[PDB]
Structure 1
C-alpha cells in the first residue's frame, strides 16, 4: 500500500497569490515527461496488440473445486516413467460422479461446469536433491488393453515450475454430472452410467518421471478440478413461510 496515494502536497492563498507544494509540482513535471514517453511508445504497443495471450484458467474466471481422489508413492528409475492409475472407464466414472456429488451437495444454485481437469501434484520425498518432473498420458484405449506399468521416456511433457500439471478432460468422451446450465434433479449413479454412450473407453492413463540420473522417490496427490460458474439470484433466503 501507499501512504498518501496520489494526493500529495497541498495549496494555500497569501495576498491573492496561489502557493503549491514543491513536491507536488515536481510530480506534475515528472508525470508530463512520462506522458510524453507513453505517447512515444504507443505505436509499438499496436504492433504487439496484433497478438494475444490466454488467461490462466485457474486464476481466471469461474470458481475452483478440487475433489482430491488419492495419494501414492512411486520410485522411478532414470529415463523411465511409472503408471499412476489404471482404472477402467467404469471405475473412473464411479469415482468422478460419487466424489463430486457427495462433496458438493446440497447444490443450492443454478450452475454449469465449465471444465474438468485431471490434476497431478508432485513433491519430492528427500531433501537436498535437484531434478524436475516429466509427464505422459493417454485418454482412451480398447477396454481389454492394460497399460504397461513402466515405460521409457520419449519426448515427454515437462511439468511446470510449481510441480503441478493439469490435463483438460473435454466434454466429448468424458461425461459430466451436470451437463449445461441447470438445476439439480433426483439423480443416481445407475441412471448416470446408463446415459453415457462409451463408459468403458475413456479413462485417463497417466505416467510420471523425472530428469534425474538416479532413482528418486515421489509423493503424488491426484485430484479432479472442476471449473464452475454459478447464477445465484440477488434475493434473500427466508425461513419458511416467507412474508
Structure 2
C-alpha cells in the first residue's frame, strides 16, 4: 500500500512517482504536475498570429518587442481582460506560449524552438538564426516558457517597477524539416492565477 505525498517549490507542485504510477523505491522520487493541469486558474491572453516561412536548419524570430512594449502589451491585455479584479489574488507565473501549425496539410516534421529571457530592451535580435541544440517541441505543437522571476494604469505599473518580476522573452521557431516550411504561429500569455475569493455573496446595494 503506497501513500501519496505532495511538495510545493515556488508554485511548482510535485507528487511522489510511486503514487502516480500505482493509479491502476519509485516512491522516493517526485514528478512535477503539469502547470496548466495543476493548481491555480489558467488565463490565456492571445496576443497575435503570425505567418513565418522557415528554411531548413534555421529558425525565425517570432517576436522582437522592446521591453516597454512587451510590458505595455502584457499589462494592457491582462488588465483589459481581468478588470474588475474583485478578490485578492497572486500571479503564480506567466507563460509565453507559442502555438504552431503548418499552413499546408500532409506535412510531417517536428517543431524546434529556442528562447532567451535576458536579454534587455537595449538589444536587437537576429531575425534568422541557425539551429543549434534546440528544444524539441512535443506533438501538442506548443512551446511554453515560464517568465517568472493593484494597478490602475500602466504608468503606475512601471512606477512600482512591477516589470522587474518577470523577463522579456524573445523566441525563435524552426523545424527538423529538409524543406522550407510555412508555419502559422499564435502567441499567447498564460497566467497562472491563485484566487483568494471569500465565502461571501454579492449583494445589490444597499446590503441588508
Q: Which band: TM-score by shorter chain? A: 0.7 to 0.9
Residue 187 of structure 2 is matched in structure 1 by 222
Distance 1:198 1:109 in 2: 22
Q: When the two structures are superposed, what TM-score results if normalisation uses the length of structure 2?
A: 0.84
Q: What is the SS of the residue equivalent to 1:87?
A: coil
Please state which structure has a larger fraction of its residues in helix.
Answer: 1
Is this contact kept in 1: 2:147–2:167, CA < 8 A?
no
Give the equivalent residue in structure 2 for 1:64.
42
Q: Counterpart of 1:59 in 2: which secondary structure?
A: coil
User: Of Structure 1 and Structure 2, which has the larger fraction of its residues in strand?
Assistant: 2
| Aligned residue runs from structure 1 range 63-82, under 5 A | 63-82=41-60
Q: What do the CA deviations read for 1:67-123 (whole angstroms, capped 9, x no partner)? A: 110110000000000000111100000001011001111111111111111000001
Structure 1 residues 187 and 101, CA, compared in 2 at 3 Å: closer, same or farther? same
In structure 1, the residue matched to 2:80 is 102
1:197 Cα shift? 7.9
Gaps of 5+ in 2: 3-17, 20-24
5 Å matches for 1:13-162?
47-162=25-140
TM-score of the superposed pair, with normalisation by structure 1: 0.72
Would you say 1:233 and 2:195 are equivalent positions? no
Name structure 1 gaps, 5 residues minimum.
Answer: 1-37, 40-44, 173-183
Cα 1:88/1:220, change in 2 over 3 Å: same
Q: Confirm or deny: 8 A CA contact 2:67 2:120 kept in the other structure.
A: no
> What is the CA-CA distance between 1:204 and the residue it aligns to?
0.9
Instruction: Note the alpha carbon deviations across 1:130-168, whole angstroms, 9 max, x for none.
Output: 101000111122543211100000100001110011100
Q: Could you list the per-position Cα deviations for residues 3-47 of structure 1 after superposition, in whole angstroms to 9, with x for gaps in the alignment?
A: xxxxxxxxxxxxxxxxxxxxxxxxxxxxxxxxxxx79xxxxx691
Tell me, in whole angstroms, the C-alpha distance in 2 between the residues paired with 1:142 and 1:210.
Answer: 27
Structure 1 contact 135–158 (Cα < 8 Å) conserved: yes
1:168 corresponding residue in structure 2: 146
Q: Do the aligned partners of residues 198 and 123 (structure 1) sit closer, same or farther apart at CA in structure 2, a change above 3 Å counting?
A: closer
- Rg larger in structure: 1
Does structure 2 conserve the Cα–Cα contact (< 8 Å) formed by 1:89 and 1:202? Answer: no
CA RMSD in angstroms comes to 2.1
